[PDB]
Amino acid sequence: ANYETYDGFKVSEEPVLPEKEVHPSLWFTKSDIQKIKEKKNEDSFTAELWEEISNSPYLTMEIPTDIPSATDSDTDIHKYYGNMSRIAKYNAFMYLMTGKSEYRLRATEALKRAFDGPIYEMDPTVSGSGVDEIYRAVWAQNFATAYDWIQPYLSDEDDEIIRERLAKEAQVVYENLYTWGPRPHNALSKPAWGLGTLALTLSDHPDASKWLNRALEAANTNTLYFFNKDGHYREGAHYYVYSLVNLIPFLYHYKNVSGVNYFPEYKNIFEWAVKIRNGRGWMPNVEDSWIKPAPTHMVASQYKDTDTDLHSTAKLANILQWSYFNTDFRPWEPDGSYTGASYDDTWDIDQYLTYDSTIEQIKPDVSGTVFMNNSGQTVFRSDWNFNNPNSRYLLFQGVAEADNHYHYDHLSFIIHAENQMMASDSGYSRNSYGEGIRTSWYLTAEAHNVITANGEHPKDVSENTTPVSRYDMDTDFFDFQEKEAVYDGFTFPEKNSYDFSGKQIRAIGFPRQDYFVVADQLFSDKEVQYDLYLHGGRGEMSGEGNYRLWTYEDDRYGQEAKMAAWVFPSKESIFIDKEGEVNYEAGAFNSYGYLNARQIAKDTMFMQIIVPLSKYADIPEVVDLSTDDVVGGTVVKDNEKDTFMQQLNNAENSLGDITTDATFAYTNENSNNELQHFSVRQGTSLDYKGENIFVSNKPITFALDISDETQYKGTIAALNETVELRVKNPVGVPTESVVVNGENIEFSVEDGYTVIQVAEGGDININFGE
Numbered sequence: 001a002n003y004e005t006y007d008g009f010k011v012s013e014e015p016v017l018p019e020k021e022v023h024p025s026l027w028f029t030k031s032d033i034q035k036i037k038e039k040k041n042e043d044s045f046t047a048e049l050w051e052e053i054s055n056s057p058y059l060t061m062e063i064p065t066d067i068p069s070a071t072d073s074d075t076d077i078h079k080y081y082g083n084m085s086r087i088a089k090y091n092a093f094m095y096l097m098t099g100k101s102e103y104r105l106r107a108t109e110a111l112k113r114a115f116d117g118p119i120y121e122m123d124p125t126v127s128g129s130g131v132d133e134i135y136r137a138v139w140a141q142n143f144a145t146a147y148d149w150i151q152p153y154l155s156d157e158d159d160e161i162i163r164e165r166l167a168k169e170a171q172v173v174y175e176n177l178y179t180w181g182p183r184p185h186n187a188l189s190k191p192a193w194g195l196g197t198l199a200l201t202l203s204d205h206p207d208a209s210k211w212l213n214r215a216l217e218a219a220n221t222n223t224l225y226f227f228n229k230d231g232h233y234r235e236g237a238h239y240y241v242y243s244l245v246n247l248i249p250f251l252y253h254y255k256n257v258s259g260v261n262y263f264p265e266y267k268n269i270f271e272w273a274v275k276i277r278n279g280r281g282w283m284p285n286v287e288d289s290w291i292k293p294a295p296t297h298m299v300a301s302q303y304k305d306t307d308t309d310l311h312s313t314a315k316l317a318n319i320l321q322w323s324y325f326n327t328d329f330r331p332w333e334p335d336g337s338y339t340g341a342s343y344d345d346t347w348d349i350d351q352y353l354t355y356d357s358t359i360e361q362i363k364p365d366v367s368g369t370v371f372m373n374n375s376g377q378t379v380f381r382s383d384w385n386f387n388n389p390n391s392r393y394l395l396f397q398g399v400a401e402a403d404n405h406y407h408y409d410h411l412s413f414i415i416h417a418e419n420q421m422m423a424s425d426s427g428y429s430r431n432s433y434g435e436g437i438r439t440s441w442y443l444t445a446e447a448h449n450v451i452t453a454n455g456e457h458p459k460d461v462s463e464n465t466t467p468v469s470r471y472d473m474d475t476d477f478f479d480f481q482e483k484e485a486v487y488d489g490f491t492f493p494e495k496n497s498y499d500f501s502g503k504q505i506r507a508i509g510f511p512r513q514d515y516f517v518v519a520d521q522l523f524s525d526k527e528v529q530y531d532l533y534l535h536g537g538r539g540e541m542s543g544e545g546n547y548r549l550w551t552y553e554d555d556r557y558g559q560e561a562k563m564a565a566w567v568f569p570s571k572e573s574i575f576i577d578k579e580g581e582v583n584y585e586a587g588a589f590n591s592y593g594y595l596n597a598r599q600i601a602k603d604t605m606f607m608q609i610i611v612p613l614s615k616y617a618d619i620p621e622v623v624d625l626s627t628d629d630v631v632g633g634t635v636v637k638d639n640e641k642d643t644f645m646q647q648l649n650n651a652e653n654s655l656g657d658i659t660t661d662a663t664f665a666y667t668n669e670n671s672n673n674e675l676q677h678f679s680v681r682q683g684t685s686l687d688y689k690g691e692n693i694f695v696s697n698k699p700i701t702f703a704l705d706i707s708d709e710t711q712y713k714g715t716i717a718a719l720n721e722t723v724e725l726r727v728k729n730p731v732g733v734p735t736e737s738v739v740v741n742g743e744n745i746e747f748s749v750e751d752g753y754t755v756i757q758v759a760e761g762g763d764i765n766i767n768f769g770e
């Protein structure tokens with residue numbers, strides 16, 4: 001695996017340390033302490049956070065006089081060092097906050113027994129080790145923080161003892177960082193930031209410059225490979241948050257101690273979370289990942305002067321604050337831990353010290369639809385409303401495979417709508433990474449919403465190269481994008497030769513921002529077996545032929561609802577009911593229906609029509625009109641007739657009322673059976689009921705709303721060269737202006753048609769008189 005070719009990001013590796021150690025200074029200086037004590041009375045959140053911290057059993061539990069030996073169980077060794085680190089930090093904090101004698105004594109004794117017992121005897125490369133690098137990253141930050149807090153109140157003797165313990169662990173971590181995490185995943189990054197905290201806590205110690213330099217070096221191998229510039233993490237939401245437990249603290253530690261502010265550089269990893277969140281503020285169960293909330297509140301304070309694309313006027317800080325608190329947290333009751341470190345973390349404290357009660361929660365006001373083409377994700381999204389059933393969310397997953405915690409999920413999608421999780425990623429596993437069922441099922445292509453050719457999964461052209469995206473179109477009435485993966489390409493484990501050569505070109509469209517169309521073009525050099533899968537998450541599957549209906553109930557993830565799905569073409573394809581596991585969180589796995597549509601062919605097409613519905617909604621009337629060269633049909637939902645059409649060539653053909661040379665075409669009628677909205681992929685004409693709507697001298701991809709006869713408005717996808725578009729005016733009405741990207745462009749009117757040269761794409765308004 002090549003770890004240096006992915007379009008990630010890295011910061012300065014130059015170690016910056018202050019002239020002289022200051023304690024406290026990691027989170028705050030001496031001056032801040034009475035402000036922090038008072039903080040508990042700002043709002044109901046700071047109140048709850050204080051209620052939790054001040055009643056922590058780590059203040060009242062007996063410091064254990066039972067040091068466990070090397071040959072004890074891996075769990076008990078974990079919890080010993082976890083509890084000790086926790087006893088140190090919780091007590092050290094509560095001494096600052098109350099001044100109670102006991103708390104200083106407990107903190108001091110716990111810090112004096114930091115990394116006592118068998119830790120340095122044992123081997124962390126061993127799998128699941130009680131002292132694995134990932135756990136002693138949290139421990140290191142817990143003890144180092146505890147020290148920074150109690151250091152002033154220590155005898156010259158106790159200071160020198162505790163300094164030598166933290167300074168040992170620091171040297172051990174420095175020496176064995178790359179041995180423990182030989183590949184740059186979260187097992188390298190987490191303990192690296194752990195070292196970073198230690199280096200900054202003991203800034204005077206002679207080795208600190210070397211410690212911090214490696215800490216930043218090792219961290220940068222993670223951000224260069226597993227992170228994208230645009231903020232995507234390739235280990236998925238779960239290991240993103242697991243990474244945050246150690247990163248977020250270090251980010252603050254290095255600012256507060258050395259005046260090195262990395263928050264601008266790490267900005268996009270927090271924006272990302274908000275962009276891929278569903279109706280209830282959950283990050284998706286993609287790659288080795290459960291559903292996860294994004295702790296964006298704990299960094300909001302640093303982005304008060306940061307612009308975002310997510311609001312016209314407001315600053316990122318306000319959106320980051322909005323995102324966290326607009327998250328359903330019921331899937332983590334009554335415990336409340338979503339970090340992945342519930343044996344080690346001090347999340348109540350770290351939230352107390354980071355939360356800023358002065359930041360106004362502001363909902364994004366921009367188009368919900370977002371195209372993050374650099375990583376390869378894309379979200380169709382009707383609105384940003386929290387826990388609204390009228391909301392529609394589709395994640396379109398086309399991300400270059402990484403070498404750790406990977407699932408085969410190219411051109412997969414998931415859907416959130418009617419407040420339920422519908423079309424599904426089958427999720428991480430039953431429970432853990434080392435389970436057979438993860439390799440035999442959960443990570444396999446078939447456990448996802450893909451198309452396999454002879455069982456081979458759609459994959460990257462070349463390693464660390466994001467699947468190409470085309471025809472990005474966002475509007476009020478219809479969004480659209482296509483992604484291209486290949487079958488005979490690059491994946492993990494590495495597989496150099498294939499019996500054939502083929503590719504998938506999956507287009508997704510968002511008709512009436514209400515339901516979805518998934519229109520696949522498939523090309524191959526040989527005849528092969530295309531298998532389309534469609535998992536309906538955790539629903540009772542029913543229905544025969546080309547139609548399936550998943551019915552959901554009030555579960556731990558949403559409300560009573562249903563998803564209806566039709567597959568085209570009906571005749572050339574066969575439909576196979578199958579049963580597979582779907583898991584959104586540890587231990588909560590179950591078997592559910594999933595559809596296997598199958599064709600045997602060389603070059604062919606599929607089309608899925610997928611419709612979220614509320615429990616007792618009428619099932620739309622969906623008619624297949626597919627033939628030899630043309631796949632597509634008609635949907636009659638809420639008294640409007642939508643028509644879809646795909647083909648493999650720019651060849652004049654018909655379906656329903658459409659006639660076009662476009663590889664894809666969409667139409668919306670109103671109650672009165674008049675064309676209102678239409679979109680085309682690389683068309684040069686479209687007739688509806690045999691009435692021409694537009695023509696062009698070259699192939700153009702655009703969507704247009706023609707429901708208002710004073711103004712036609714839509715968008716035109718990116719252009720390679722000047723096109724002469726000609727749109728038909730409403731009968732006997734003159735064109736006044738044409739606006740593309742808020743600038744006028746030159747227009748004539750010939751035979752009832754507005755005529756424009758367009759050399760770049762963007763939002764178009766054709767403005768009409770009377």
Ligand SMILES: O=C(O)[C@H]1O[C@@H](O[C@H]2[C@H](O)[C@H](O)[C@H](O[C@H]3[C@H](O)[C@H](O)[C@H](O[C@H]4[C@H](O)[C@H](O)[C@H](O[C@H]5[C@H](O)[C@H](O)[C@H](O)O[C@@H]5C(=O)O)O[C@@H]4C(=O)O)O[C@@H]3C(=O)O)O[C@@H]2C(=O)O)[C@@H](O)[C@@H](O)[C@@H]1O
Binds near residue numbers: 181242337340
């Ligand atoms: O607090 C809670 O809510 C629950 O937390 C639970 O803790 C979980 C965490 O949430 C994470 O899932 C954490 O992630 C670990 C995971 O436990 C495993 O250790 C897994 O193991 C593999 C590594 O990821 C990595 O792939 C490694 O690769 C090797 C590979 O074999 C090969 O030889 C190659 O050449 O070398 C590499 C290498 O670099 O070493 O193999 C590891 C393996 O063991 O197979 O890694 C993840 C990770 O990425 O960090 O796991 C904990 C956990 O304890 O389970 C849990 O405590 C639960 O009880 C709580 O309720």
Ligand SMILES: [Ca+2]
Binds near residue numbers: 406408410
């Ligand atoms: Ca993947």
Ligand SMILES: [Ca+2]
Binds near residue numbers: 479
């Ligand atoms: Ca839109």
Ligand SMILES: [Mg+2]
Binds near residue numbers: 125126128187
């Ligand atoms: Mg290890």
Ligand SMILES: [Mn+2]
Binds near residue numbers: 285287425427443
């Ligand atoms: Mn998966």
